[PDB]
Amino acid sequence: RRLVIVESPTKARKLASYLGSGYIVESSRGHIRDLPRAASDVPAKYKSQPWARLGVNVDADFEPLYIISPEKRSTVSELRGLLKDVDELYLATDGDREGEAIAWHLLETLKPRIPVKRMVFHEITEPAIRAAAEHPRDLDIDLVDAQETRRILDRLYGYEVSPVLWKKVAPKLSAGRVQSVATRIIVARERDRMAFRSAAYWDILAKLDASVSDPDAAPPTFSARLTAVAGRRVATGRDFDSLGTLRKGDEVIVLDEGSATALAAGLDGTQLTVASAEEKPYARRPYPPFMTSTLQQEASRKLRFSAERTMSIAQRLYENGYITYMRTDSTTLSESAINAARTQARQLYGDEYVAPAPRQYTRKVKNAQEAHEAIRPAGETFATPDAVRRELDGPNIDDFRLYELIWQRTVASQMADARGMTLSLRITGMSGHQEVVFSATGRTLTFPGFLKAYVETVDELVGGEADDAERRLPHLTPGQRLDIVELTPDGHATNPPARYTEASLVKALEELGIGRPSTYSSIIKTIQDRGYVHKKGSALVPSWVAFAVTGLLEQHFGRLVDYDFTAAMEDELDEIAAGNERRTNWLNNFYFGGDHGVPDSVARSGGLKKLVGINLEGIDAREVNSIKLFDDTHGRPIYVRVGKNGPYLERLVAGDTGEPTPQRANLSDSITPDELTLQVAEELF
């Protein structure tokens, strides 16, 4: 008989049902080996090596020490029994570098003498599994070296950086490179909010009627806003910087309440005149099929799922044969999937809404072996979301919602474009002796197209307009008169930059090239668990400890938390996965120093060991645990310190001949860092 090893029991039962008899299917429950987690994990043979606890022999080309987990040994025993009376072996783990490394570890652990076959697949269906089992491929050692390079890199990073965090910030603080970079993103946005200063600006909102000079203009009444006063443009929210002063761009005029009421008063009684009216046709192409990044984003905005929950649901959907592999950076659809989406599309929305030619959204992927297709429904024919809503009855009651999202996205990717018109409106009038201009913008939707099947949701904090929202304006002619219904002077203020959500954080991690489909949700979940970041509604808010660690790394180990260097490291790991870079050369280069890599990187600056040593002794600590905020109304610098009791406020005041003497207050997590202003600081003292 034949043996087949997978990672989870569900995958094992499904593959067992599809392969039939003559195949035995067992799971390995994930990884069977790992680096030593304690001194007791080191076998007696390696206890003579002083590097065994670290598990990496940096002086022997980073030779790792792989030990079988104490709870996993029994599993291996079972796998060592089944291999006795079978005549063939099949490693059916996931096709990414994780699953390839699991396969490699299984080979090193079991050491089979019968032929070995690695079968890969990105959907669990009977045709795809039977096809994969009949056409195997060789074990990609480059993927194994990429995953292994990541593991060793993380072990060395923790080994070199964790003690710094224990001595300078707080013990029991777990280190983490990419986590500290994403934490730096969030801390940077919070700092931007703290330094922000609002600025006031005023305009005039007008309600205009056109049913007198055009007794059939729909809509009859529309809105317009003041844009110019006697040739000078009226300031808006975009004309100020983060400190509240006008930008060094075009010349504008800032209005207040008295000026706006004066202009509206001098405008009442008269009429306005249409100066310009321009309609431009536009077409909107459908959204690409889902990948991990876009799936987590849209699942967060529309379904309020966290990235972790999205990936859990998507894992259960994938292993049960409902969706394709959820860890992909590809938006490609095979011909059968395209034909399925076009069939369901024509069946549900009609022939005019189908794209007249099959649409392909092929983009550059990081590795052609790890990602084949997009996240889409599985099979030659897509299971209807109602049938899936029938089968998934019980504890998992959102899986049908995620599945329906994927289905609507996939079907909508093969539908027709969305036609419409965009409208520009320039109006003029006379307030006293000053000419005034009233602008109005419009946008219609003549044909919805794919928008009848899928519409992306706007980010909650960023705000904006959806792709199917209409701002309809009547058809007007240059020189047409308009009647004024109301003149309301309007006041506004510049708003601070928006906080990140999980969706906008995932988008940032992808744009900066810092995250991969395998790491988004783990980055978010990890930075939330370790206490660096918490949630206010849907906003990510950094704690003060996150300020302390981010400040330390920024001030003394800047290369570790630089965005471009981190993205470069991810690109080099990917280059190892493709066989263009070698694990040994990269690890020597990064740890001990070399001549390869982007300028001024850790590898080009002496390596990780020497840089952590040099930068560690190059500090005097002192204010590492102090986050400077501002000064008070007497000139005393106020800052926040993180101690055993948590975050507390501190300043320095004189103290009767024995001056100075510090003053401390206590603050909980109720006050976000941007709310802790000078007034709030004085109230808490």
Nearest to 552 by CA among 173, 168, 185: 168
Same domain, 353 and 446: no
Cα separation, 382 vs 466, in Å, equals 28
Same domain, 275 and 422: yes
Residue 649 lies in a domain: no
Whole domain around residue 154: which residue ranges?
146-194+497-607
- Tokens 């859990």 identify what position? 312
CB 24 within 8 A of CB 4: yes
CB 223 within 8 A of CB 208: yes
Handedness of CA 132, 138, 139, 143 (dihedral sign): negative
Same domain, 482 and 595: no
Same domain, 6 and 133: yes
- CATH number at 488 reads 2.70.20.10
- Number of domain units in the chain: 4
CB 341 within 8 A of CB 290: no
Phi-psi region of 231 (alpha: psi -120 to 50; beta: other; left: phi over 0): left
Same domain, 540 and 506: yes
Domain C-terminal end among 463, 496, 529: 496
Same domain, 87 and 133: yes
User: 325 catalytic, yes or no?
Assistant: yes
Same domain, 1 and 139: yes
Same domain, 338 and 412: yes
Helices and strands: H and E segment counts in the chain: 19, 22
- CATH number at 1 reads 3.40.50.140
Same domain, 502 and 564: yes
Find the catalytic residue in 325, 454, 532, 591: 325
Q: Which contacts qualify for 58-65: CB closer than 8 Å, 24 or more apart?
A: 58/156, 58/591, 58/592, 61/584, 61/587, 61/588, 62/152, 62/583, 62/584, 62/587, 62/588, 62/591, 64/35, 64/148, 64/151, 64/152, 65/35, 65/36
Domain C-terminal end among 445, 471, 496: 496
Resolution of the experimentally solved model in angstroms:
2.7
Residue 7 lies in a domain: yes
Sheet with 116-118: list strands edge to edge: 23-27, 2-6, 88-91, 116-118
Residue 661 lies in a domain: no
Same domain, 175 and 226: no
Cis peptide before 50 (omega within 30 of 0): no
Task: Give the contacts of 634 (CB within 8 A, at least 6 positions apart).
Answer: none
Nearest to 75 by CA among 97, 98, 47, 106: 106
Tokens of 95: 């096709």
CB atoms within 10 A of CB 375: 28
Cα separation, 255 vs 259, in Å, equals 6
- CATH number at 364 reads 1.10.290.10
Q: In terms of DSSP bridges, do strands 67-68 and 481-493 run parallel, antiparallel, or are they unpaired?
A: unpaired
* Angle (CA) 428 430 436, round 5°: 50
Residue 637 lies in a domain: no
Same domain, 210 and 308: no
Residue 101 lies in a domain: yes
Q: How far is CA 645 from CA 126, 534, 541, 597, 626, in A?
A: 58, 18, 20, 43, 15
- CATH number at 530 reads 1.10.460.10
Residue 663 lies in a domain: no
Tokens of 185: 């993103």
Same domain, 177 and 317: no
Domain C-terminal end among 386, 416, 446: 416
